[PDB]
């Protein structure tokens, strides 16, 4: 029977059956609760809402994401998400199909263990696995030699996996991510007069972030371009239809990906964590890794990011070397695409932990082939 | 020549010369205009009124504040406030004396610029500076490691500072403040049938505020007691002689600072905006800043607010941590006091923006050291 592939992203959950080239369901991963007393007894309203239902009701709910930095900060709101993932978004009985989950590198060991217990003892799955997010991607890229910069709403990872044999010691996890840049976009938009505070406003800021913002090829020169001209000014209409004119802000918002000093984190930019991850590996493989640098996850979708990346690592890396930032269109779901491939790749059919194995070795079984 | 230190706060403009221990002027930051047409022409009645003149003619006037939530909403009526601040309250010619203006954190860039334009071009000040109001409350207490919680009528902000360096990525501005707390008192006074709607009546309710609200140490216990017996209720005579009475409402009014949900906002209370601010800075810089929660601004005047802050934030903070709430006498006026102290320093003579600089640099000069 067809297995299910589910990516528990900190911002949006992507799920579907194996074999398909796009994940059928995308509930933005949000649970939300009524911000006020319900008054119309005739409306048939409900306790709390999820995904696009949460987005629909947004202006009257407090919104909580139950995954932060990949850690499942709340298990009941995650389990609500899975109940809606399976029985509402996909209309499938997870107790009749094997399931593959996805998880971040270096995430706390306890997370995999709780996930496993919820799958095997809430959703009664027949067999289960939890693939390391980056890994799946190179499968989605085809190439089995490369370094994956995965950057989503929560984590950022830079695994180098070579000749198809990993290099786990060289993995670097940087907790700068899309949520962090949404939060920074609120601060910089304040400077021109616009107030955003509520959880619901965080989603409007997210919309501004996904449309008008882009990565400067050179910060100082484009800065100077503002200082000289209105030429980068563009405008966005709030739900009120009032237009808000943002600028100098687009090439600042994500400049944080290259300068985390803007946001009071200490660690180096995503280019520097890319170069430094390559430099952890044994000196032969580096030529091949520079030629197989892979981007994935929604925050890699900024216009200009490839150009900036390629020039930035071309500064850090050697001269007389070639740098290939392999960054395709559809880079976004280049995980529930890799998981689709992995569950389809029939040699993997021994890897799924059976419920009977978990019922004997307990939570210790999950530490089978992970980092 | 002596400098002038002026705090344009949303309720009152505290002004006076440097070095003194209290301001020479403390007038409500209000302008007023007649609500009805005039008849006794021999009076020569004024085109507009300000300050305690507006408190004197108060019942026949439309009243407005030109400062809200720290933004100057009306530059004409703000220029009136400054004209009176200098030429009547202090009788000084500002064109002959440097001026230190105070400004809120995380406020639009245009406000620093439009202020500075008026100061150099209307009032011809010889030099100027625009100090962060938080930094001044720390100078006012003499300490140089702590977190300033400053709140008067328009803004509540928490700013941590350590060994005199800023921690700007950890500033939180919650727009729940004294004006809002007054709005809420008007709503809940309506529950007992006491009604207040005109802008003059609004400021009678401000008066009730000042002298009648305490911030109970436990809301469930106190609300139970006030539902159980009438002993806690106190009365207040209107200017029209009749006695209002305040019961649960006494402590409900500032309870909002610890439950902003009463006022419809999603935001966590002032204890939570303090705790979340200390958690935004490094682990090192912490136990220290938990021994140094420094309060300022007129909404920090409620009886029991220091006790409530302690018994709240100590429940959020880790056990075996020393939490202390440095709530000084004259927390009412700390910033003037802080500004006076900063204007006393020799090295601060190197910090000023001079009019000769402004005329050659343009408006961008006002931003060198700001949040």
């Amino acid at each position: 029977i067809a297995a299910l592939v589910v990516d528990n992203g900190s911002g949006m959950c992507k799920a579907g059956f194996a074999g398909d080239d796009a994940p059928r369901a995308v509930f933005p991963s949000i649970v939300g609760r009524p911000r006020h007393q319900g008054v119309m007894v005739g409306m048939g309203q409900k306790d709390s809402y999820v995904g696009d239902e949460a987005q629909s009701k947004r202006g009257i709910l407090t919104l909580k994401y139950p995954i932060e930095h990949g850690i499942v900060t709340n298990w009941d709101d995650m389990e609500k998400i899975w109940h809606h993932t399976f029985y509402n978004e996909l209309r499938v009985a997870p107790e009749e199909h094997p399931v593959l989950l996805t998880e971040a590198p270096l995430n706390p060991k306890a997370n995999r263990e709780k996930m496993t217990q919820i799958m095997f003892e809430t959703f009664n799955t027949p067999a289960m696995y939890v693939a390391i997010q980056a890994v799946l991607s190179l499968y989605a890229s085809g190439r089995t030699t490369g370094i994956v910069m995965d950057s989503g709403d929560g984590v950022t990872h830079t695994v180098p996996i070579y000749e198809g044999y990993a290099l786990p010691h060289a993995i670097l996890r940087l907790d700068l991510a899309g949520r962090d840049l949404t939060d920074y976009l609120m601060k910089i938009l304040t400077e021109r007069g616009y107030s955003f505070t509520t959880t619901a406003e965080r989603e409007i800021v997210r919309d501004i972030k996904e449309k008008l913002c882009y990565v400067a090829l050179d910060f100082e020169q484009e800065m100077a371009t503002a200082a000289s001209s209105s030429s980068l000014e563009k405008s966005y209409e709030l739900p009120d239809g009032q237009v808000i004119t943002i600028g100098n802000e687009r090439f600042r918002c994500p400049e944080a990906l290259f300068q985390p000093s803007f946001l009071g984190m200490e660690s180096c930019g995503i280019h520097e964590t890319t170069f430094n991850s390559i430099m952890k590996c044994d000196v032969d493989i580096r030529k091949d890794l520079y030629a197989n640098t892979v981007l994935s996850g929604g925050t890699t979708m900024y216009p200009g990011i490839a150009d900036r990346m390629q020039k930035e690592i071309t500064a850090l890396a050697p001269s007389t070397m070639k740098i290939k930032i392999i960054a395709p269109p559809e880079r976004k779901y280049s995980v529930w695409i890799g998981g689709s491939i992995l569950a389809s790749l029939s040699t993997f059919q021994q890897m799924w932990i059976s419920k009977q194995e978990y019922d004997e070795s307990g939570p210790s079984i999950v530490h089978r082939k992970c980092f | 020549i002596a400098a002038l230190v002026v705090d344009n706060g949303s309720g009152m403009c505290k002004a006076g010369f440097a070095g003194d221990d209290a301001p020479r002027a403390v007038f409500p930051s209000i302008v007023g205009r007649p609500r009805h047409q005039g008849v006794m022409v021999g009076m020569g009645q004024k085109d507009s009124y300000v300050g305690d003149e507006a408190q004197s003619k108060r019942g026949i006037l439309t009243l407005k504040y030109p400062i809200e939530h720290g933004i100057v909403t009306n530059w004409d009526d703000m220029e009136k406030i400054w004209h009176h601040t200098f030429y009547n309250e202090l009788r000084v010619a500002p064109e002959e004396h440097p001026v230190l203006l105070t400004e809120a954190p995380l406020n639009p860039k245009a406000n620093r610029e439009k202020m500075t334009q008026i100061m150099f071009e209307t009032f011809n000040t010889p030099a100027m500076y625009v100090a962060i109001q938080a930094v001044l409350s720390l100078y006012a207490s003499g300490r140089t490691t702590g977190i300033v919680m400053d709140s008067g009528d328009g803004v509540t902000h928490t700013v941590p500072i350590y060994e005199g360096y800023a921690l700007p990525h950890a500033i939180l501005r919650l727009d729940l403040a004294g004006r809002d707390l007054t709005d809420y008192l008007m709503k809940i006074l309506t529950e007992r049938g006491y009604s207040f709607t005109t802008t003059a009546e609004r400021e009678i309710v401000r008066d009730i505020k000042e002298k009648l609200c305490y911030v109970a140490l436990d809301f469930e216990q106190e609300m139970a007691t006030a539902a159980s017996s009438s002993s806690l209720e106190k009365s207040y005579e209107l200017p029209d002689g009749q006695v209002i009475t305040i019961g649960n409402e006494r402590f409900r009014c500032p309870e909002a600072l610890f439950q902003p949900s009463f006022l419809g906002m999603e935001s966590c209370g002032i204890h939570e905006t303090t705790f979340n601010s200390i958690m935004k800075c490094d682990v090192d810089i912490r136990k220290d800043l938990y021994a140094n929660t420094v309060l300022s601004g007129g909404t920090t005047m409620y009886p029991g607010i220091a006790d409530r802050m302690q018994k709240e934030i100590t429940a959020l903070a880790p056990s075996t941590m020393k939490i202390k709430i440095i709530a000084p006498p004259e927390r009412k006026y700390s910033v003037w006091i802080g500004g006076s102290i900063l204007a006393s320093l020799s090295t601060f003579q190197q910090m000023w923006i001079s009019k000769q600089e402004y005329d050659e640099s343009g408006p961008s000069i006002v931003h060198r050291k700001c949040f």
Binding site: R192, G193, Y194, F196, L238, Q242 | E68, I71, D175
Partner: peptide, 7 residues
């Protein structure tokens, strides 16, 4: 209100 947008 006061804010240029958002209040």
């Amino acid at each position: 209100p006061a804010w240029x947008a958002x209040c």
